[PDB]
Design a binder for these strands. Structure first.
Ligand SMILES: [Mg+2]
Ligand SMILES: [Mg+2]
Ligand SMILES: [Mg+2]
Ligand SMILES: [Mg+2]
Ligand SMILES: [Mg+2]
Ligand SMILES: [Mg+2]
Ligand SMILES: [Mg+2]
Ligand SMILES: [Mg+2]
Ligand SMILES: [Mg+2]
Ligand SMILES: [Mg+2]
Ligand SMILES: [Mg+2]
Ligand SMILES: [Mg+2]
Ligand SMILES: [Mg+2]
Ligand SMILES: [Mg+2]
Ligand SMILES: [Mg+2]
Ligand SMILES: [Mg+2]
Ligand SMILES: [Mg+2]
Ligand SMILES: [Mg+2]
Ligand SMILES: [Mg+2]
Ligand SMILES: [Mg+2]
Ligand SMILES: [Mg+2]
Ligand SMILES: [Mg+2]
Ligand SMILES: [Mg+2]
Ligand SMILES: [Mg+2]
Ligand SMILES: [Mg+2]
Ligand SMILES: [Mg+2]
Ligand SMILES: [Mg+2]
Ligand SMILES: [Mg+2]
Ligand SMILES: [Mg+2]
Ligand SMILES: [Mg+2]
Ligand SMILES: [Mg+2]
Ligand SMILES: [Mg+2]
Ligand SMILES: [Mg+2]
Ligand SMILES: [Mg+2]
Ligand SMILES: [Mg+2]
Ligand SMILES: [Mg+2]
Ligand SMILES: [Mg+2]
Ligand SMILES: [Mg+2]
Ligand SMILES: [Mg+2]
Ligand SMILES: [Mg+2]
Ligand SMILES: [Mg+2]
Ligand SMILES: [Mg+2]
Ligand SMILES: [Mg+2]
Ligand SMILES: [Mg+2]
Ligand SMILES: [Mg+2]
Ligand SMILES: [Mg+2]
Ligand SMILES: [Mg+2]
Ligand SMILES: [Mg+2]
Ligand SMILES: [Mg+2]
Ligand SMILES: [Mg+2]
Ligand SMILES: [Mg+2]
Ligand SMILES: [Mg+2]
Ligand SMILES: [Mg+2]
Ligand SMILES: [Mg+2]
Ligand SMILES: [Mg+2]
Ligand SMILES: [Mg+2]
Ligand SMILES: [Mg+2]
Ligand SMILES: [Mg+2]
Ligand SMILES: [Mg+2]
Ligand SMILES: [Mg+2]
Ligand SMILES: [Mg+2]
Ligand SMILES: [Mg+2]
Ligand SMILES: [Mg+2]
Ligand SMILES: [Mg+2]
Ligand SMILES: [Mg+2]
Ligand SMILES: [Mg+2]
Ligand SMILES: [Mg+2]
Ligand SMILES: [Mg+2]
Ligand SMILES: [Mg+2]
Ligand SMILES: [Mg+2]
Ligand SMILES: [Mg+2]
Ligand SMILES: [Mg+2]
Ligand SMILES: [Mg+2]
Ligand SMILES: [Mg+2]
Ligand SMILES: [Mg+2]
Ligand SMILES: [Mg+2]
Ligand SMILES: [Mg+2]
Ligand SMILES: [Mg+2]
Ligand SMILES: [Mg+2]
Ligand SMILES: [Mg+2]
Ligand SMILES: [Mg+2]
Ligand SMILES: [Mg+2]
Ligand SMILES: [Mg+2]
Ligand SMILES: [Mg+2]
Ligand SMILES: [Mg+2]
Ligand SMILES: [Mg+2]
Ligand SMILES: [Mg+2]
Ligand SMILES: [Mg+2]
Ligand SMILES: [Mg+2]
Ligand SMILES: [Mg+2]
Ligand SMILES: [Mg+2]
Ligand SMILES: [Mg+2]
Ligand SMILES: [Mg+2]
Ligand SMILES: [Mg+2]
Ligand SMILES: [Mg+2]
Ligand SMILES: [Mg+2]
Ligand SMILES: [Mg+2]
Ligand SMILES: [Mg+2]
Ligand SMILES: [Mg+2]
Ligand SMILES: [Mg+2]
Ligand SMILES: [Mg+2]
Ligand SMILES: [Mg+2]
Lengths: 97, 146
RNA sequence: GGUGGGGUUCCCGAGCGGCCAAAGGGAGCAGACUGUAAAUCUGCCCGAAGGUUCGAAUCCUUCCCCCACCACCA
RNA sequence: GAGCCGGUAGCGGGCGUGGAUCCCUGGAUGUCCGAAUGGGGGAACCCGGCCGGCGGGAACGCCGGUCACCGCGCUUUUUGCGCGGGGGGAACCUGGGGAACUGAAACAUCUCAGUACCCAGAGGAGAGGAAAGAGAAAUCGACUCCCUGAGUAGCGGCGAGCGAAAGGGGACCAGCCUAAACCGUCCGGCUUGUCCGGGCGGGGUCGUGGGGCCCUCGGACACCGAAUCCCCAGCCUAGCCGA
RNA sequence: CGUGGUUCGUGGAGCCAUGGGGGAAUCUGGGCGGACCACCGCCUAAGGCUAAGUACUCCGGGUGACCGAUAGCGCACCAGU
RNA sequence: GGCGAGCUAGCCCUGGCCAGGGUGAAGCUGGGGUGAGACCCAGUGGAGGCCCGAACCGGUGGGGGAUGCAAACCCCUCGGAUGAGCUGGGGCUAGGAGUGAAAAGCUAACCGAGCCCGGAGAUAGCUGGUUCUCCCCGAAAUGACUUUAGGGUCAGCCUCAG
RNA sequence: CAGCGUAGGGUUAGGCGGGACCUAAGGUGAAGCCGAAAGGCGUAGCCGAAGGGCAGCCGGUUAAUAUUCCGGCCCUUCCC
RNA sequence: AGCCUGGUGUUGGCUCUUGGUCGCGCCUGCGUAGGAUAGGUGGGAGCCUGUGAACCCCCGCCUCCGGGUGGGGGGGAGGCGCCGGUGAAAUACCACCCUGGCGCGGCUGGGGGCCUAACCCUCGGAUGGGGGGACAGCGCUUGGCGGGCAGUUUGACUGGG
RNA sequence: GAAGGGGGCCUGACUGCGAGGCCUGCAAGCCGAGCAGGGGCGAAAGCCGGGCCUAGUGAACCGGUGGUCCCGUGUGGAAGG
């Protein structure tokens, strides 16, 4: 679970590719791969900790989608409950029907 | 980043003025401090509806003292006073002027803020002015007998 | 291959558009002082071709080497 | 349709034309363990709450019922209730992850290979699918599968090796729902406002671009028609006649 | 920018996907025809569902120039014993 | 990808065990000593990875055993034996990992990288093996190149058809 | 003859051990935290004993059981 | 792998201070010579001043201090140029440029202080208090160090090697 | 009887080819008359496609540079070959 609670973004596997030599297009004989190996790429994930109704709700999101946390706060109707709260404010409110 | 200001901030000026700012500010100062709100197509809309609703009943209120300017600035109320020679026994006051204007010509004034200074003790022709905001001078005739 | 610095009297070295035998240092020579050796002191003495102006050691093109650096190698 | 009480005789007893045994469909019973779910736990054992019952029955014990967790939904949050999930399955399927030996007659890129395998999920299939496609023809029309294109075009320490698609021929055939505009309703927040937001209904769904809103045209039986529901044939789960 | 997918191993390297940064428009909008530009075309992305033709064989059946007890399944027999 | 710490190594929790002798620290007390002390001498005392030695834990030297009684044993002898002691029960850590007073020791009788099943019929220019009969012909062990030299490619030499 | 074949018999508990008690290491784990999936962690709680707590001694009896049956003498907890 | 590190995200407020560049403006330069204290080229006998002059009184900064130069102002109707020559240039006023400087403004940079509110630690106490603080942590990206680990390479001939 | 030494004019240390052979496992290595173009030296015959000769070397692949006609992913260009 290092995954963005709004966007859905999660870590992907990627190769890290080590190259040598001069681009063919700089008049080099061309690039060469000295190694290829798997790494991954995490989302740039942050806390957004926000106050909604009585309570203080904390989203874990990709820094990318940080705005949508505030969009979800602009959606306010009638919740006096505990944390959860976002269980409501979430995909129920992100999409629904 | 576009926020609608909820009070004058001194460079970032007064209420309702849409100002753009580093998100960090917005998110972690203005917004949680309730001292502003981000300008959505949603909120920009209430703001228009908010400026309309204001300047509606505002230039509605200027439809009274424009209407009471075009009546009281011609019509003259005449005041009976127990006579004396160029001196009154009682005193015609704001309160009186109010009432007299009511029973006579059928109008209503406060009579707050007309001329409160020194309720008028003499006879003659006086011009007093009414209010609030651009407004009307009135003619009042204090005369004789009863 | 590329970039950046150079090139000056025997060595180093500053080098400026109004001339700069061209600062200065040391080297060499000749004087002064001298136990030896010195230290001190005084005097003696523009890489290249072309080109811009009235003036070129100064600015440009070019050529030759040096130093420096980065990069490539089937 | 005459024998039967399994493999299994035997002892000792029984049943069947008032139709047994046996076969097929449905039902009932179904200890304890097991996702295992009252709670524990070294699976098949242990210890309980609640309601009801049995015994002399308060203590004790037995019996029946009920009681895990998670998700969704309404609900006055609550007393809660309803519906669901969970685990298994030969291979097959999709998705998340993902090797090495080996090959390169050494070895790193490359290969083996997106294989093996591990994980999640789906079902009787799964995936995919109704063009922001192809790709040179004013061309074709979803997707899948076979043949072919073709070991072609290309890819490649241009090595070892890797290896498409368009088109053509077949199989099968099917096309739909929405979001927004706009209209209506309910609720919530309010600096009641032609306000903003959420919920529901209507509306609309496409590329010779479509749709909303306004005007005109007549827009009338209409026709079309499910992948949803109902009936039926047929098929499966026992058998029967048969020179 | 970093990568994956494709025949495409950085290649003139587009297309589809997307971890990171910046970050639009609503038909006169956008994507594509292999860098890019023009022209001429194709198509309308960022919501969803969709039988059949296909894969398989625990299971039942039918066939075999299939085996016949060292074979055929590991097991023809009370064997995953 | 799993299975293993019921063996063995370390640690954690909780219990248990160590006959009997010996030596005689400090301290205490008393006495001496001094200005006061240090100190000395007695008695008491009972310390210690202190001594001897059973149990227990070991494994030094030699002999025997060697298709063993035994896949580590038996005899004699020997080390420790209140400690860094031994030991029962309950637990934890594991495969490029653990654990190790360190030998690359140990990690279920072979550990310089455990076992099991899988990739898998890995690869094996090497070694072995390759099954009835008759007929004809019938070689090579050289050259060139080879990360090649006991392997190959082309050539040479055998054979068969036209 | 047997630890062997066939057959029959044989293990008796409020007090002994364990459980309807406690907690230890550790394990597990409402809360919570982390992690591509699998899963790791974790407060309380819970589980977990050869520790803590808890009431039976002597003798007779069987072919075979006995602090369990019997005899004598004692004791504990629940309920009323 | 780990560690170090530039850029950037998360990431904000307030100041102080510096660059770079661009536009505009205000200046800057001086070989005896021309009379000297004229950057270059062009336009040039017309100007500029009474859209209040020279000559001094304050004052600014530059200077080869010969002075240059502007403001304040005492201040009142002149101050100039050609001509002339031993230096090319010609020494008013108007532009377009060079060399250096300053002035403001534009986009981008680089530093320093303080703040708190993100983020982090903490407080039997929390919609809070204290501490750190836009650092640190973390994502993406840059270059580096890297037997701690990984995969491998480490020729043949040869009177054995 | 020059391949040695000197002098003069010169650049054949040409381009396009190449009968036929030496060698030879392949791939290479080698010699070469002759024709064409345009030349040089020579009065001419003639000679001249480096040097008395036999060593002075390196397959392919990848890339550089100069040129040219060739291809240019719908088309013209361009990228790249
Ligand atoms: Mg990288
Ligand atoms: Mg935050
Ligand atoms: Mg962004
Ligand atoms: Mg002397
Ligand atoms: Mg019978
Ligand atoms: Mg019947
Ligand atoms: Mg039944
Ligand atoms: Mg249970
Ligand atoms: Mg019950
Ligand atoms: Mg359980
Ligand atoms: Mg009851
Ligand atoms: Mg399942
Ligand atoms: Mg299932
Ligand atoms: Mg997959
Ligand atoms: Mg490999
Ligand atoms: Mg290998
Ligand atoms: Mg190999
Ligand atoms: Mg090999
Ligand atoms: Mg090898
Ligand atoms: Mg592959
Ligand atoms: Mg299913
Ligand atoms: Mg289907
Ligand atoms: Mg689908
Ligand atoms: Mg492949
Ligand atoms: Mg086809
Ligand atoms: Mg069709
Ligand atoms: Mg609808
Ligand atoms: Mg509404
Ligand atoms: Mg709707
Ligand atoms: Mg509808
Ligand atoms: Mg339209
Ligand atoms: Mg019959
Ligand atoms: Mg690729
Ligand atoms: Mg690619
Ligand atoms: Mg390559
Ligand atoms: Mg394109
Ligand atoms: Mg696109
Ligand atoms: Mg296209
Ligand atoms: Mg298209
Ligand atoms: Mg669209
Ligand atoms: Mg669509
Ligand atoms: Mg489907
Ligand atoms: Mg079958
Ligand atoms: Mg047999
Ligand atoms: Mg068999
Ligand atoms: Mg037989
Ligand atoms: Mg067998
Ligand atoms: Mg152990
Ligand atoms: Mg004992
Ligand atoms: Mg004493
Ligand atoms: Mg003593
Ligand atoms: Mg002792
Ligand atoms: Mg001892
Ligand atoms: Mg000893
Ligand atoms: Mg001893
Ligand atoms: Mg021994
Ligand atoms: Mg021995
Ligand atoms: Mg001993
Ligand atoms: Mg001894
Ligand atoms: Mg122990
Ligand atoms: Mg291992
Ligand atoms: Mg280790
Ligand atoms: Mg084992
Ligand atoms: Mg062992
Ligand atoms: Mg190994
Ligand atoms: Mg084999
Ligand atoms: Mg294999
Ligand atoms: Mg090998
Ligand atoms: Mg013969
Ligand atoms: Mg050989
Ligand atoms: Mg060999
Ligand atoms: Mg041969
Ligand atoms: Mg017996
Ligand atoms: Mg009793
Ligand atoms: Mg218990
Ligand atoms: Mg307990
Ligand atoms: Mg756990
Ligand atoms: Mg106990
Ligand atoms: Mg006990
Ligand atoms: Mg007891
Ligand atoms: Mg007894
Ligand atoms: Mg007995
Ligand atoms: Mg008794
Ligand atoms: Mg501070
Ligand atoms: Mg503070
Ligand atoms: Mg407190
Ligand atoms: Mg605080
Ligand atoms: Mg930071
Ligand atoms: Mg190594
Ligand atoms: Mg290294
Ligand atoms: Mg050798
Ligand atoms: Mg020999
Ligand atoms: Mg030798
Ligand atoms: Mg000659
Ligand atoms: Mg020939
Ligand atoms: Mg000729
Ligand atoms: Mg190669
Ligand atoms: Mg080439
Ligand atoms: Mg030609
Ligand atoms: Mg062409
Ligand atoms: Mg194109
Ligand atoms: Mg083209």
């Amino acid at each position: 679970s290092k995954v963005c609670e709004i966007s859905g973004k999660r870590p992907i596997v990627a190769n890290s590719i080590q190259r040598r030599g001069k681009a063919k297009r700089e008049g080099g004989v061309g690039k060469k791969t000295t190694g290829i190996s798997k790494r991954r790429q995490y989302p740039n994930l942050q806390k957004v900790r926000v106050r909604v109704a009585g309570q203080e709700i904390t989203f874990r999101v990709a820094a990318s989608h940080i705005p949508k946390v505030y969009e979800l706060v602009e959606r306010a109707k009638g919740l006096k409950l505990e944390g959860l709260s976002p269980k409501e404010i979430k995909k129920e409110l992100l999409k629904l029907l | 980043m576009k926020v609608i200001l909820l009070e004058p901030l001194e460079n970032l000026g007064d209420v309702g003025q849409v100002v753009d700012v580093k998100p960090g500010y917005a998110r972690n100062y203005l917004l949680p401090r309730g001292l502003a709100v981000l300008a959505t197509e949603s909120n920009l809309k209430a703001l228009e509806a908010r400026i309309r609703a204001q300047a509606k009943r505002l230039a509605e209120r200027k439809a009274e003292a424009e209407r009471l300017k075009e009546i009281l600035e011609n019509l003259t109320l005449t005041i009976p006073v127990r006579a004396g020679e160029t001196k009154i026994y009682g005193s015609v006051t704001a309160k009186d002027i109010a009432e007299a204007l009511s029973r006579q010509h059928g109008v209503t004034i406060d009579p707050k803020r007309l001329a409160l200074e020194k309720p008028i003790k003499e006879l003659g022709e006086y011009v007093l002015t009414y209010k609030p905001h651009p407004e009307v001078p009135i003619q009042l005739k204090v005369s004789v007998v009863a």
